[PDB]
Design goal:
Blueprint lengths: L9 H7 L1 H6 L3 E5 L10 H11 L4 E3 L36 E9 L4 E9 L4 E8 L1 H10 L3
Antiparallel strand pairs: 1-2, 1-5, 3-4, 4-5
PDB class: gene regulation
Keywords: core binding factor, transcription factor, gene regulation
Assembly: monomeric
Length: about 140
């Protein structure tokens, strides 16, 4: 009823949807992109592609390749403005980086989160709910 980009029961859909359930809580993940290059460059390029904005990252647990969307409620695309540490680009963590990208799959503002270790750009991540974006997107549904 004139409210896409959201569902009513967002917080139930977060736990209902097979898509989110396959990504689950804290599991193992891998990058899936320009990382398919040889090693040397792909480590720095990885944090540059993370800084571009959107990217593509997969899981291990179900092996769900998804397009990550480093687009906060102010969308940018112009190679990062000023997001969080954990969101994008945090001066570089302990041989890893932390990443955090709210997705709007079904009409659930989830958070995809994780750390991708720099070793090959594989690591750990999962979903959470974005309890603010869900409210904001419910507003932005011309409410």
């Amino acid at each position: 009823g004139s409210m896409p980009r959201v569902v009513p029961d967002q917080r139930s859909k977060f736990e209902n949807e097979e898509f989110f359930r396959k990504l689950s809580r804290e599991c193992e993940i891998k990058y899936t992109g320009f990382r398919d290059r040889p090693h040397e460059e792909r480590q720095t390029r990885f944090q540059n592609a993370c800084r571009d904005g959107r990217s593509e990252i997969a899981f291990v647990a179900t092996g769900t390749n998804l397009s990550l969307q480093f687009f906060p409620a102010s969308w940018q695309g112009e190679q990062r403005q000023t997001p969080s540490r954990e969101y994008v680009d945090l001066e570089r963590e302990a041989g890893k980086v932390y990443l955090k990208a709210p997705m709007i799959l079904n009409g659930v503002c989830v958070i995809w989160k994780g750390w991708i270790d720099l070793h090959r750009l594989d690591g750990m991540g999962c979903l959470e709910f974005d309890e603010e974006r869900a409210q904001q997107e419910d507003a932005l549904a011309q409410q």
